[PDB]
């Protein structure tokens, strides 16, 4: 279970980083409009 | 440490949902 929980933290951190990248991209578009 | 890791998953999930909501709203704003 400890390894599974560690893996899930790592998974969510990567999902979150993807979303942060999307938010940056969209904020750039917002600025341009 | 099991419990502390569970708490971290929970914090990262709430953050995930916050960012998902933010992406959706920014997308609707810009017509994507």
mmCIF file of C-alpha atoms in Angstrom:
data_model
loop_
_atom_site.group_PDB
_atom_site.id
_atom_site.type_symbol
_atom_site.label_atom_id
_atom_site.label_comp_id
_atom_site.label_asym_id
_atom_site.label_seq_id
_atom_site.Cartn_x
_atom_site.Cartn_y
_atom_site.Cartn_z
ATOM 1 C CA UNK A 1 0.000 0.000 0.000
ATOM 2 C CA UNK A 2 2.865 2.452 0.717
ATOM 3 C CA UNK A 3 4.204 2.115 -2.851
ATOM 4 C CA UNK A 4 0.679 2.376 -4.306
ATOM 5 C CA UNK A 5 0.058 5.617 -2.342
ATOM 6 C CA UNK A 6 3.456 7.009 -3.456
ATOM 7 C CA UNK A 7 2.626 6.141 -7.076
ATOM 8 C CA UNK A 8 -0.748 7.930 -6.743
ATOM 9 C CA UNK A 9 0.864 11.089 -5.369
ATOM 10 C CA UNK A 10 3.298 10.990 -8.334
ATOM 11 C CA UNK A 11 0.393 10.393 -10.760
ATOM 12 C CA UNK A 12 -1.620 13.335 -9.410
ATOM 13 C CA UNK A 13 1.386 15.622 -9.344
ATOM 14 C CA UNK A 14 1.930 14.929 -13.053
ATOM 15 C CA UNK A 15 -1.773 15.422 -13.876
ATOM 16 C CA UNK A 16 -1.655 18.722 -11.938
ATOM 17 C CA UNK A 17 1.435 19.874 -13.784
ATOM 18 C CA UNK A 18 -0.324 19.142 -17.046
ATOM 19 C CA UNK A 19 -3.275 21.277 -15.947
ATOM 20 C CA UNK A 20 -0.971 24.092 -14.811
ATOM 21 C CA UNK A 21 0.598 24.058 -18.289
ATOM 22 C CA UNK A 22 -2.879 24.223 -19.882
ATOM 23 C CA UNK A 23 -3.829 27.141 -17.608
ATOM 24 C CA UNK A 24 -0.676 29.035 -18.651
ATOM 25 C CA UNK A 25 -1.448 28.429 -22.323
ATOM 26 C CA UNK A 26 -5.056 29.594 -21.913
ATOM 27 C CA UNK A 27 -4.068 32.630 -19.886
ATOM 28 C CA UNK A 28 -1.721 33.566 -22.727
ATOM 29 C CA UNK A 29 -4.665 33.380 -25.164
ATOM 30 C CA UNK A 30 -6.821 35.452 -22.805
ATOM 31 C CA UNK A 31 -4.110 38.142 -22.820
ATOM 32 C CA UNK A 32 -4.107 38.155 -26.624
ATOM 33 C CA UNK A 33 -7.865 38.577 -27.129
ATOM 34 C CA UNK B 1 3.361 7.427 6.845
ATOM 35 C CA UNK B 2 0.383 5.611 5.243
ATOM 36 C CA UNK B 3 -1.930 8.240 6.660
ATOM 37 C CA UNK B 4 0.291 11.167 5.722
ATOM 38 C CA UNK B 5 0.447 9.850 2.094
ATOM 39 C CA UNK B 6 -3.359 9.507 2.041
ATOM 40 C CA UNK B 7 -3.627 13.161 3.140
ATOM 41 C CA UNK B 8 -1.264 14.187 0.287
ATOM 42 C CA UNK B 9 -3.353 12.323 -2.342
ATOM 43 C CA UNK B 10 -6.392 14.212 -0.953
ATOM 44 C CA UNK B 11 -4.668 17.616 -1.175
ATOM 45 C CA UNK B 12 -3.457 16.868 -4.738
ATOM 46 C CA UNK B 13 -6.951 15.727 -5.776
ATOM 47 C CA UNK B 14 -8.559 18.966 -4.511
ATOM 48 C CA UNK B 15 -5.879 20.967 -6.359
ATOM 49 C CA UNK B 16 -6.551 18.832 -9.499
ATOM 50 C CA UNK B 17 -10.234 19.665 -9.360
ATOM 51 C CA UNK B 18 -9.540 23.322 -8.825
ATOM 52 C CA UNK B 19 -7.304 23.356 -11.933
ATOM 53 C CA UNK B 20 -9.801 21.345 -13.934
ATOM 54 C CA UNK B 21 -12.494 23.935 -13.130
ATOM 55 C CA UNK B 22 -10.103 26.771 -14.028
ATOM 56 C CA UNK B 23 -9.194 25.137 -17.424
ATOM 57 C CA UNK B 24 -12.931 24.643 -18.230
ATOM 58 C CA UNK B 25 -13.774 28.284 -17.410
ATOM 59 C CA UNK B 26 -10.782 29.709 -19.306
ATOM 60 C CA UNK B 27 -11.694 27.515 -22.282
ATOM 61 C CA UNK B 28 -15.296 28.790 -22.263
ATOM 62 C CA UNK B 29 -14.029 32.358 -21.946
ATOM 63 C CA UNK B 30 -11.841 32.050 -25.098
ATOM 64 C CA UNK B 31 -14.230 29.918 -27.208
ATOM 65 C CA UNK B 32 -12.033 26.797 -27.247
#
